[PDB]
């Protein structure tokens, strides 16, 4: 039992690089975060900022989540991110992804004590 907070970090944090350099980033990262183990996770964003900067979002602009709950937060500033989306031809277990590097606001849901990100809702 990974905590929700730990799951968020595994799925979404990539503080080791400033930006995706190559079009193969998503293929590489989705595999190495074990997001293609049982199925190809269809959509996933990686954030290239410090964990502290991402946790800090829980103290920023309170917004509704896509699901209607009101424990989401939008980052005041843009962040370096990489969107990963499975291509239409991708088939498990040969998962393939489209990599898009971007600078966008992130929206995360926060929960707990400490009050930390547990879900990535969207980028703007
Ligand atoms: Cl989950």
Q: How many CB atoms lie within 10 A of CB 90?
A: 16
Of the candidates 29, 49, 119, 121, the residue annotated as catalytic is 119
Q: Is 31 annotated as a binding residue?
A: no
- Please state whether the peptide bond connecting residue 114 to the residue before it is cis, i.e. omega within 30 degrees of 0: yes
Distance 80 CA to ligand 1 centre (A): 24
Look at the chain and report how many structural domains it folds into. Answer: 1
Longest Cα–Cα distance of the chain, Å, equals 42
Q: Is 119 a catalytic residue?
A: yes
DSSP string, 47-115: E-S-HHHHHGGGGSEEE--TTS-S-EEE-SS-EEEEEEEE-SS-BTTB--EEEEEEEE-EEEEEETTTT
* Residues whose CB falls within 8 Å of the CB of residue 37, separated by 6 or more in sequence, listed in order: none
Choose the catalytic residue: 9, 12, 14, 95.
Answer: 12
34 is in an annotated binding site: no
Do residues 54 and 108 touch, judged by C-beta distance below 8 A?
Answer: yes
Question: Is 105 a catalytic site residue?
Answer: no
112: Cβ–Cβ under 8 A, 6 or more apart, which residues? 4, 5, 118
The answer to whether the beta carbons of residues 51 and 57 sit under 8 Å apart is: no
Establish whether 7 is an annotated binding residue: yes
Separation of alpha carbons 41 and 57, rounded Å: 24
Evaluate whether 80 touches 30 at the Cβ level (below 8 Å). Answer: no
Strand 72-74 relative to strand 61-63: parallel, antiparallel, unpaired? antiparallel
List the resolution, Å.
1.5
Strand order in the sheet with 106-111: 61-63, 72-74, 106-111, 116-123
The range of the structural domain enclosing residue 77 comes to 1-124
């Amino acid at each position: 039992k990974e905590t929700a907070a730990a799951k968020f970090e595994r799925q979404h944090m990539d503080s080791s690089t400033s930006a995706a350099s190559s079009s193969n980033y998503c293929n590489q990262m989705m595999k190495s975060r074990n997001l293609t183990k049982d199925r190809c996770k269809p959509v996933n964003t990686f954030v290239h900022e410090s964990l502290a900067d991402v946790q800090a979002v829980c103290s920023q602009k309170n917004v509704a989540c896509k699901n209607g709950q009101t424990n989401c937060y939008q980052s005041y500033s843009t962040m370096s991110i990489t969107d990963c989306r499975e291509t239409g031809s991708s088939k498990y277990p040969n998962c393939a992804y489209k990599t898009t590097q971007a600078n966008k606001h992130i929206i995360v849901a926060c929960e707990g004590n400490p009050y930390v990100p547990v879900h990535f809702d969207a980028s703007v």
